[PDB]
Design a protein around this ligand. Structure first.
Ligand SMILES: Nc1ncnc2c1ncn2[C@@H]1O[C@H](CSCC[C@H](N)C(=O)O)[C@@H](O)[C@H]1O
Ligand SMILES: NC[C@H](O)c1cccc(C(F)(F)F)c1
Length: 257
């Protein structure tokens, strides 16, 4: 976890959200697939409410695109200052912010409601009230008196848990921890890597717990969830780039019962 102190956001983003992986043009790529999972899931309109929290946002927003048109109060979080600062930059349209425009576009394309992407971003920025520090290893991961209206009506988290946890049980506790933030009857949309064990981000070389679809399911159940959907994307050769050793990406829609 002290490895995360050398974590370089610009190199993360570059490694994982710029082309090839960041070229949204081929619909068989991983970005289109993630974006579509979120989109489909919300267009069901069974995931709805007033507040929502992004767990381990790091320096990224795509995970909230389709989401943001359904929850008026959206809280973002990450363990690192540097990331909370990089999010700041895009939220406030400051100089040198990252360019998500491609992602916004495709969310708009995928949702098919004829929305322009500036309207979409405009809505996201507007609905993101706060960026908060977070440690999922803590049993109240946000702290005590957090500005975050609890309990949240829903949780979103991508590539965090399995990437902050040294092992399967550790991963499992973290899940219990965040689940604490989620109002009962509420919804969790979880996206992560499958059987990934390391991934780079500049100088920082991070270790990952290689989980599996079955492990992830059991884990969601153990933590008190009803699994409404679990889907798997197998990484194609040409998206294997040596910034990691990820084999697939998984997406899960789970309802706390
Ligand atoms: N103990 C911890 N608790 C919560 N987040 C942590 C953490 N330790 C590291 N992190 C954060 O977990 C993030 C993993 S990278 C994930 C970024 C983004 N959600 C995506 O879809 O790409 C990093 O931003 C990192 O800072
Ligand atoms: N967990 C970090 C990992 O390198 C990662 C982040 C985002 C996307 C992807 C991938 F493209 F699915 F491999 C991997």
């Amino acid at each position: 976890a002290s490895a995360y102190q050398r974590f370089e956001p610009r190199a993360y983003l570059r490694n994982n959200y710029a082309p090839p992986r960041g070229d949204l043009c081929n619909p068989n790529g991983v970005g289109p697939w993630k974006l579509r999972c979120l989109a489909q899931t919300f267009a069901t309109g069974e995931v709805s409410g007033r507040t929502l929290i992004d767990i381990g946002s790091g320096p990224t927003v795509y995970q909230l695109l389709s989401a943001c048109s359904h929850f008026e109060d959206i809280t973002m979080t990450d363990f690192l200052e540097v990331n909370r600062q990089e999010l700041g930059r895009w939220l406030q349209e400051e100089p040198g912010a990252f360019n998500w425009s491609m992602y916004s576009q495709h969310a708009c394309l995928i949702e098919g409601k004829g929305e322009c992407w500036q309207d979409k971003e405009r809505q996201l920025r507007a609905r993101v009230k706060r960026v908060l520090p977070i440690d999922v290893h803590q049993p109240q991961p946000l702290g005590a008196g957090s500005p975050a209206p609890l309990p949240a009506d829903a949780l979103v988290s991508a590539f965090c848990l399995e990437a902050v946890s040294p092992d399967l049980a550790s991963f499992q506790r973290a899940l219990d921890h965040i689940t604490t933030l989620l109002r009962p009857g509420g919804h969790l949309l979880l996206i992560g890597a499958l059987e990934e064990s390391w991934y780079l981000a500049g100088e920082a070389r991070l270790t990952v717990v290689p989980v599996s679809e079955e492990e992830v399911r059991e884990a969601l159940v153990r933590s008190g969830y009803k699994v409404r959907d679990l889907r798997t994307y197998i990484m194609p050769a040409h998206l294997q780039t040596g910034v990691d050793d990820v084999k697939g990406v998984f997406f899960a829609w789970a309802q706390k019962v």
